[PDB]
C-alpha cells in the first residue's frame, strides 16, 4: 500500500535467537531505522536459526 517499504539485510545486521527457524524463507525484524527482510534460495530450506 506504499506506506512503508521493507529493505534487505546487511552482514552487520544480526539475527535474534528467539524463534525456531525451521522451514523458513522470509521473516521480518523491525529495527531502529527501518524494516528488514531476509531470504534464502528455493530448495534452500531454512532448518536452523543460523544465517
Amino acid at each position: 500500500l506504499g506506506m512503508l517499504v521493507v529493505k534487505k539485510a546487511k552482514g552487520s545486521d544480526m539475527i535474534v535467537p528467539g524463534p525456531s527457524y525451521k522451514g523458513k524463507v522470509l521473516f521480518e525484524r523491525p529495527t531502529f531505522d527501518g524494516y528488514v527482510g531476509w531470504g534464502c534460495g528455493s530448495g534452500k530450506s531454512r532448518t536452523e536459526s543460523g544465517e
Partner: protein
C-alpha cells in the same frame, strides 16, 4: 570447535587459518574479538566455528 559440516571437521590448515583468516563465519564471542570478516558466502560456505 571448527567443523566443515561436510566430510567432518575442518583441516589443520583450515583451523589454523580460521584463527587468522577472514572468510569462515561463526556465532558471537567469535566476531567481536576474533574478527568474523563474514565473507558473504552465498554458496559453499567455509567451515563455521562456534562454542
Amino acid at each position: 570447535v571448527c567443523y566443515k559440516e561436510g566430510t567432518g571437521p575442518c583441516s589443520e590448515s583450515e583451523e589454523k587459518a580460521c584463527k587468522t583468516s577472514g572468510s569462515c563465519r561463526g556465532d558471537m564471542q567469535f566476531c567481536k574479538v576474533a574478527g568474523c570478516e563474514h565473507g558473504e558466502e552465498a554458496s559453499e560456505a567455509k567451515c563455521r566455528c562456534s562454542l
